[PDB]
Amino acid sequence: TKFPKFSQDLAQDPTTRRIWYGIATAHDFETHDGMTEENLYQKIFASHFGHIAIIFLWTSGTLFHVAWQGNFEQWIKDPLNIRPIAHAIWDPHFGEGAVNAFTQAGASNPVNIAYSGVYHWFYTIGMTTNQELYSGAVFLLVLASLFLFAGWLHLQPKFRPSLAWFKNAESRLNHHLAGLFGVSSLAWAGHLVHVAIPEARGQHVGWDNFLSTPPHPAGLMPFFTGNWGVYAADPDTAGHIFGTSEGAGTAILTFLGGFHPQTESLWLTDIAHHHLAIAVIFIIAGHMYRTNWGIGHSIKEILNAHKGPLTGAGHTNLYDTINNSLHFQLGLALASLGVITSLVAQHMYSLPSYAFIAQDHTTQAALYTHHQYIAGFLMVGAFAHGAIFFVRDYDPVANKDNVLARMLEHKEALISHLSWVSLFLGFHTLGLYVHNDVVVAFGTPEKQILIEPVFAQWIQATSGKALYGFDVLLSNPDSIASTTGAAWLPGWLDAINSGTNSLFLTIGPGDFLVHHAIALGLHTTALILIKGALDARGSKLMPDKKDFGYSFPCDGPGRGGTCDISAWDAFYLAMFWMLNTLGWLTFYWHWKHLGVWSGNVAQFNENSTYLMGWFRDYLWANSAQLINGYNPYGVNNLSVWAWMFLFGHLVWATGFMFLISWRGYWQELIETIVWAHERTPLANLVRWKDKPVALSIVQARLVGLAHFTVGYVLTYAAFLIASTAGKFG
Amino acid sequence: SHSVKIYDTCIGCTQCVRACPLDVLEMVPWDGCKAAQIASSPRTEDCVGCKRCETACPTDFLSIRVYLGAETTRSMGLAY
Amino acid sequence: ALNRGDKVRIKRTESYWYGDVGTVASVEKSGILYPVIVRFDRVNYNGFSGSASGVNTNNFAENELELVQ
Amino acid sequence: MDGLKSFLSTAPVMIMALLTFTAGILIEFNRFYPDLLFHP
Amino acid sequence: MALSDTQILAALVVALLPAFLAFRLSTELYK
Amino acid sequence: DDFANLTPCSENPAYLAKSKNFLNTTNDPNSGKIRAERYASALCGPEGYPHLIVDGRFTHAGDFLIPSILFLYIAGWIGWVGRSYLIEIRESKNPEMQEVVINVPLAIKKMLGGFLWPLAAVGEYTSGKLVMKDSEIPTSPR
Amino acid sequence: MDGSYAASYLPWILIPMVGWLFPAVTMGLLFIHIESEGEG
Amino acid sequence: FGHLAVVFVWLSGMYFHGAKFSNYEGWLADPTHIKPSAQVVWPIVGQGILNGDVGGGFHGIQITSGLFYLWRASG
Amino acid sequence: FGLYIHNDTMRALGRPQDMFSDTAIQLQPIFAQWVQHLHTLAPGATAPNALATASYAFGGETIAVAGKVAMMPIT
Ligand code: CLA
Ligand code: CLA
Ligand code: CLA
Ligand code: CLA
Numbered sequence A: 001t002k003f004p005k006f007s008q009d010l011a012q013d014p015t016t017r018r019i020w021y022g023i024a025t026a027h028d029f030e031t032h033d034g035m036t037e038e039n040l041y042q043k044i045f046a047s048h049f050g051h052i053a054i055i056f057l058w059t060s061g062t063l064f065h066v067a068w069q070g071n072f073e074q075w076i077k078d079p080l081n082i083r084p085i086a087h088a089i090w091d092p093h094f095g096e097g098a099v100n101a102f103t104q105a106g107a108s109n110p111v112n113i114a115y116s117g118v119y120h121w122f123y124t125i126g127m128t129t130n131q132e133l134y135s136g137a138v139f140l141l142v143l144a145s146l147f148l149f150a151g152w153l154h155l156q157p158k159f160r161p162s163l164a165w166f167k168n169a170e171s172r173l174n175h176h177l178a179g180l181f182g183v184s185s186l187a188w189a190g191h192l193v194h195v196a197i198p199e200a201r202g203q204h205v206g207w208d209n210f211l212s213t214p215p216h217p218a219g220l221m222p223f224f225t226g227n228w229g230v231y232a233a234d235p236d237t238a239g240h241i242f243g244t245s246e247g248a249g250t251a252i253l254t255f256l257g258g259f260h261p262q263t264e265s266l267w268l269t270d271i272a273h274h275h276l277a278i279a280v281i282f283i284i285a286g287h288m289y290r291t292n293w294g295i296g297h298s299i300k301e302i303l304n305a306h307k308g309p310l311t312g313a314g315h316t317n318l319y320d321t322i323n324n325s326l327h328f329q330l331g332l333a334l335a336s337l338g339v340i341t342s343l344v345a346q347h348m349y350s351l352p353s354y355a356f357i358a359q360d361h362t363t364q365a366a367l368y369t370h371h372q373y374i375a376g377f378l379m380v381g382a383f384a385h386g387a388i389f390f391v392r393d394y395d396p397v398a399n400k401d402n403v404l405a406r407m408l409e410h411k412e413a414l415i416s417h418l419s420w421v422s423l424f425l426g427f428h429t430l431g432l433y434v435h436n437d438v439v440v441a442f443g444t445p446e447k448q449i450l451i452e453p454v455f456a457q458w459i460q461a462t463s464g465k466a467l468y469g470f471d472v473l474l475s476n477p478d479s480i481a482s483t484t485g486a487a488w489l490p491g492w493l494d495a496i497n498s499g500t501n502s503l504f505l506t507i508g509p510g511d512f513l514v515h516h517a518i519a520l521g522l523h524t525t526a527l528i529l530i531k532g533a534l535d536a537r538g539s540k541l542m543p544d545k546k547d548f549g550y551s552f553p554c555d556g557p558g559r560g561g562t563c564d565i566s567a568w569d570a571f572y573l574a575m576f577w578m579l580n581t582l583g584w585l586t587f588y589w590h591w592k593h594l595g596v597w598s599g600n601v602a603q604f605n606e607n608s609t610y611l612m613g614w615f616r617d618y619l620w621a622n623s624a625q626l627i628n629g630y631n632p633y634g635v636n637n638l639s640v641w642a643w644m645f646l647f648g649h650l651v652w653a654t655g656f657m658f659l660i661s662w663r664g665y666w667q668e669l670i671e672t673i674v675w676a677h678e679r680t681p682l683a684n685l686v687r688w689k690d691k692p693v694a695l696s697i698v699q700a701r702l703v704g705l706a707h708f709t710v711g712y713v714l715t716y717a718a719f720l721i722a723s724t725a726g727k728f729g
Numbered sequence B: 001s002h003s004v005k006i007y008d009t010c011i012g013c014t015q016c017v018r019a020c021p022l023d024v025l026e027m028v029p030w031d032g033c034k035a036a037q038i039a040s041s042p043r044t045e046d047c048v049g050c051k052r053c054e055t056a057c058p059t060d061f062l063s064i065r066v067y068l069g070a071e072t073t074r075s076m077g078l079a080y
Numbered sequence C: 001a002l003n004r005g006d007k008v009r010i011k012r013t014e015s016y017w018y019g020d021v022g023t024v025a026s027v028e029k030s031g032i033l034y035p036v037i038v039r040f041d042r043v044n045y046n047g048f049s050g051s052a053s054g055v056n057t058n059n060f061a062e063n064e065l066e067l068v069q
Numbered sequence D: 001m002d003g004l005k006s007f008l009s010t011a012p013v014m015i016m017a018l019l020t021f022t023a024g025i026l027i028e029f030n031r032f033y034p035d036l037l038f039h040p
Numbered sequence E: 001m002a003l004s005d006t007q008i009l010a011a012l013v014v015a016l017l018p019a020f021l022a023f024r025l026s027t028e029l030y031k
Numbered sequence F: 001d002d003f004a005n006l007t008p009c010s011e012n013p014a015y016l017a018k019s020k021n022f023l024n025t026t027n028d029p030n031s032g033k034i035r036a037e038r039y040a041s042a043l044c045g046p047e048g049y050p051h052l053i054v055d056g057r058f059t060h061a062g063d064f065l066i067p068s069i070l071f072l073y074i075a076g077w078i079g080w081v082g083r084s085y086l087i088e089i090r091e092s093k094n095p096e097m098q099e100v101v102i103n104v105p106l107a108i109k110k111m112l113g114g115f116l117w118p119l120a121a122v123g124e125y126t127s128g129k130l131v132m133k134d135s136e137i138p139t140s141p142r
Numbered sequence G: 001m002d003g004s005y006a007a008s009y010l011p012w013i014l015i016p017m018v019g020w021l022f023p024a025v026t027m028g029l030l031f032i033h034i035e036s037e038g039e040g
Numbered sequence H: 001f002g003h004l005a006v007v008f009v010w011l012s013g014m015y016f017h018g019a020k021f022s023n024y025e026g027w028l029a030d031p032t033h034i035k036p037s038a039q040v041v042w043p044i045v046g047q048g049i050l051n052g053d054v055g056g057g058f059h060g061i062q063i064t065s066g067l068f069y070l071w072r073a074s075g
Numbered sequence I: 001f002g003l004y005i006h007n008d009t010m011r012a013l014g015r016p017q018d019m020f021s022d023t024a025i026q027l028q029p030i031f032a033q034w035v036q037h038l039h040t041l042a043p044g045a046t047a048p049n050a051l052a053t054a055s056y057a058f059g060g061e062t063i064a065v066a067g068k069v070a071m072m073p074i075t
């Protein structure tokens, strides 16, 4: 059999495992038959080109469908009432009830409602007509074409890069820091100054007349003379109406701080000075590493110099380890991307940038949940690929005595202390929750154990929150830090000291309990991942686990039984804990923000201290509108969300077949089915080509986890969207 | 097919040979142990990787190891 | 160099008793790769799933042990 | 009896005895002094 | 004002090009 | 002036309204009144329920610090007597057998000699018997 | 089904191709490829 | 024989707890107005709320095993 | 179970006339209905010396004690 050409062991398999494992190991280039380092790197480079092209095509499609079947040019005229439209609906299986229900947003056909918040983003960056959206879509199509051709070309034999070109860390860091980060952010600041701000002040600027009109009445003279303060003079007033000239300033780079009075978002001039300053900082940073002119630092010398007297070898030889290993780099990148994705969610739900996006609550909830789930996935992937590195790329003789090889020296202490902290969190957190539940159940809720989150309230006070009366730092109007005349202080203190926004929401005892529960979840998921990564090389039960690879089923029932012993099994276990922690996080966020938006903060303040309140006031209470999407009496626009809710509740359960039942039973059943097919007249004419077999053990775990995760995501997505849209949208 | 390897820690206890259900192992003369015999795996093309041989081995960790590889009709134990 | 009645520490690095202490049961004439026999109080993992015990003895070479006594 | 004393000293009997002793301590202290949220 | 059908057809014609380039890139990566 | 959003339950209208109906946990008919008079001295939220302060201040020491030491003494007692019994039973030619069949005389002897556990632990740490060297402990392959 | 967007006839043909024609064709070609013997 | 002894102990327990800690005589007068009840909870930590009102001035856990109807059917 | 899934989808799409319901495509358990009809007629002739049906679940009058229904026909 030809498929799979990249592996001969799988190509000679007569069963159906050949197809499954060919699909599974397709994009794992490091273990293909006869794979060289150079070819591996070049294939990776081309594939990365492909993913970039796919991303650009996806963005172009979003833009195109919004421009074609949306209501952008009517949404701009009333962002506070009109619902954004994602794409039209063409379902031949629809009935008349669904057609009448989904003809929403003042359309003339069945249509969806966008909850990705792209309308706010497009409005904020100055796109006011759908022709501009169409032009952007076509330009993105062209960009994707260019990137696909670039991948094809740099795959050609004479344009094929060398191995040393792929291992030039200094030049790559310099170019990507100064150019990819600094220059791109500088160009973005230029876009905001030259186009976005004038469009916010009711001036139409496009390609046809941007080269003529200067962004400021004094163009480029103060910048070179040194009179920069001119650009910050006469900012937009608090009576500014977005998109018009009513009460608008002429300043382009300001440090106004706080939020726009109307849009409840950050000032665009603040965005401009922010991205410009960031661009300057990145351009300075990009000139750090020497490439070929003598000037600059070399990473190897830096790492070998920073040796420690307590760590034996310090960061010795880490340059070679990181440069030779691709899994190390992928783990570092995934960890960083996950951390900054969680940061993006946290700092965007509280500091909205796009106009009128705070009012649209469903989109805010969706964005927070989406980017937080993505951050969790990336964080799991970082540890998974780090464990893969330990299995494959780690050298115990090149890294002798450095910090990396010293983790394995005190790995037992790491795992033991981490397990202790997880147990300590879990025991007492569950104890407090159950204590509150029982106490409230007996009709005496005044005996609840309610701890005030003192430290976080103190942090809020330090940032300038005067509600709690700590009067420390920015809350103290006499401290040095609050008397520096910083330009952002008045507006920032005005924004933080109003409960109308999510900026530093008021906290209470239930917030304390749920933050400590989230800490439990984080420490436990980290425990699973770290134990799997550190035990990847081997353990007492399997001292030679490295010789078995990364993903193997077990070692049989011998030595007491060794089910789920590979590091892949540690990843498979930690995925569940990631999902559970994300569930706790998003439930907390959603309930608190539902209370905030409705104004009934008292509900969360009271009933979040015991689990029955979570079960009743959040799960039972908010589900009423969702499950009534379709009724024996009729159907409304939430019908699709109810169907998807049940769809998730079904796929989640379906995953339990693979998670609970194991292989031998299904293999025996398949043997009986094979016998039945072979003995059936008129059915022996048709015979299989690959002998049917049951799914392998690792494949079974993966498939069950996939069904589980898809159901888990879909159920909560449907519930969140339906509840928030019915209640508010 | 799976690969069965016997390391130099075998004590010639013959447990692995008897535990093997598909007749892959064998006892051959040797000198490194008191029993003056060691285990060999001449018929690894018939091994299904059931790990009974390893379960029978009494030495510390395992003197006999089984690594699972390419799956054929024999090594998958198919009757159809 | 050892004999019966010696407490030794293991250095096999793959054994179950790496870092443990065991008693020297017996040794014999040369020609054998691992002559020394060491018996341990804590049994290892050996046995089928759900078994009630393991194995308390093993064979080690001379240079895999350190003498304590 | 020797066997009777040995059986009484086995792990489950002893842990049950200690658990019931501690449960009695807590039950009595909570009957006589209920609703102790803290030491004032 | 809304888009014109000629714009949609032109968009499809333009999108034809990245399809061909993607097919070429995939065939090159198959080798 | 900490906790400007918190007021004592004695001056909280919500607590004053809701404390007249406190239930009786035991058969004692005054336990509701005792609960009310004891909880009047705490800091209450807008919901009229007491809140605890654990920032370390001694004015609210009864909230966490006193029960903290109360728990710590008992937990140390239990751990120390368990460890001492295990250590003394190890060299009995059947420590595994005596782990399922408890040696009641020795168990009680260790139970009694366990109130001085902090001093004993401090002395043992200075004597080096509390911890073992990393070269004397079984370790798994790296 | 019909809509008021420009070129309303495009879904009428595009959706069936991406729903029936394209999946049928790609699964047929994939089944043919994954079963071609030899040239492993 | 042992399991028979255990079952007999359980049955005697049910009969005793219906004899002493139940309102069977009370329920027997107005069975359409008194809920069956044969479990009474000590008030210790507020579980005395479980001794709910089953009618006729008796406070205890309402039972659903149908023992009262069986006993009345037995005379 | 695909009957249930099909009904769910038909209701979701605003197609109640395509469902498997009593006001739609019907799946009448006519065999159990027939056996109920037979068991209701048993006191008449098939068991002449019986006064009433073995149970009112099969059919007949509605037996109610106090204000609550004790047993009524189960269609
Ligand atoms: C019998 C049930 C049924 C069916 C067949 C459909 C069918 C459809 N609905 Mg639909 N719908 C249903 C019930 C159903 N609906 C119900 C009960 C509701 C609730 C009222 C809705 C609500 C609804 C809405 C709100 C919308 C639709 C839309 C659509 C269309 C989307 C086209 C599409 O997805 O193509 C693309 C196909 C896919 C994305 C399927 C991919 C799935 C797999 C898992 C991914 C591929 C994995 C793997 C890599 C594949 C390998 C390659 C492969 C080729 C072999 C399609 C015609 C949409 C529409 O009109 O489109 C414009 C739309 O907006 N439906
Ligand atoms: C100035 C010159 C320059 C530039 C612009 C680039 C640019 C790039 N190189 Mg690169 N490279 C260079 C010189 C340069 N290189 C040199 C000299 C070498 C040899 C030493 C290399 C060797 C090299 C390799 C080996 C690879 C690249 C790759 C890449 C691409 C990474 C893909 C990506 O995520 O980008 C997009 C990234 C950004 C736009 C910025 C990251 C975003 C951060 C996290 C901040 C987030 C922004 C903001 C907060 C969010 C915006 C929100 C908004 C959407 C609303 C990128 C296009 C990779 C590739 O495959 O590309 C084809 C790759 O594998 N480069
Ligand atoms: C930048 C991203 C990135 C990159 C480039 C890689 C690269 C790689 N990973 Mg890695 N990984 C990542 C992120 C990444 N990973 C993350 C975030 C995680 C955490 C989940 C992992 C977890 C992980 C594991 C656990 C393993 C790898 C492995 C690998 C290697 C290739 C084998 C493979 O996964 O292909 C094959 C991939 C698949 C078969 C995935 C198919 C599953 C699909 C996408 C799910 C679709 C679900 C369903 C259809 C949705 C339909 C919805 C509809 C019904 C509504 C390769 C080095 C493997 C390895 O060890 O290589 C040596 C391996 O075992 N990775
Ligand atoms: C609600 C379900 C649930 C619960 C309570 C736990 C609890 C625990 N898991 Mg866990 N787990 C679960 C589901 C659950 N898991 C699932 C579905 C998976 C996916 C396979 C995992 C995968 C998993 C892994 C991979 C790991 C854990 C670990 C842990 C422990 C970490 C300590 C902790 O978080 O709290 C502290 C513990 C608790 C709150 C549980 C104790 C609860 C009782 C009430 C305490 C009192 C005992 C009780 C009185 C006994 C009465 C018995 C008698 C009536 C017969 C803990 C024992 C980690 C571990 O071992 O940590 C060291 C670990 O490595 N779990």
Ligand SMILES: CCCCCCCCCCCCCCCC(=O)OC[C@H](COP(=O)(O)OC[C@@H](O)CO)OC(=O)CCCCCCCCCCCCCCC
Residues within 6 Å of the ligand: C049, C050, C051
């Ligand atoms: C709502 C009902 C909830 C119960 C659902 C039933 C779950 C199915 C039952 C399990 C299979 C039954 C036979 C077990 C299967 C079997 O026999 O053993 C299987 C398993 C050991 O199996 P291995 O194959 O490892 O054993 C081989 C060894 O036996 C070598 O001889 O033993 C146990 O599961 C240990 C459980 C002991 C339990 C320890 C706690 C004792 C508590 C006793 C209190 C009991 C309740 C008291 C009365 C209330």
Ligand SMILES: CC1=C(/C=C/C(C)=C/C=C/C(C)=C\C=C\C=C(C)\C=C\C=C(C)\C=C\C2=C[C@H](C)[C@H](O)CC2(C)C)C(C)(C)C[C@@H](O)C1
Residues within 6 Å of the ligand: F054, F055, F056, F057, F064, F065, F075, F076, F077, F078, F079, F080, F083, F121
């Ligand atoms: C002695 C003993 C043992 C052994 C014990 C050992 C070996 C212990 C070893 C401990 C080590 C190695 C390290 C310990 C570190 C402890 C730290 C870091 C304590 C930190 C304390 C803090 C941060 C206090 C914080 C605040 C303090 C204050 C009360 C505030 O209001 C509240 C709050 C929470 C803010 C056992 C386990 C064997 C048996 C036991 O019974 C006894």
Ligand SMILES: CC1=C(/C=C/C(C)=C/C=C/C(C)=C/C=C/C=C(C)/C=C/C=C(C)/C=C/C2=C(C)CCCC2(C)C)C(C)(C)CCC1
Residues within 6 Å of the ligand: A327, A328, A330, A331, A332, A335, A336, A339, A382, A383, A385, A386, A387, A389, A533
């Ligand atoms: C095993 C392994 C691995 C994995 C692991 C991981 C992935 C990890 C992660 C980790 C993580 C992920 C971490 C994180 C961290 C973080 C941090 C460390 C932070 C810090 C911060 C800070 C410090 C801050 C500060 C501040 C504040 C607070 C305020 C003000 C401002 C400032 C900034 C000052 C790797 C692959 C690597 C390699 C190989 C091996």
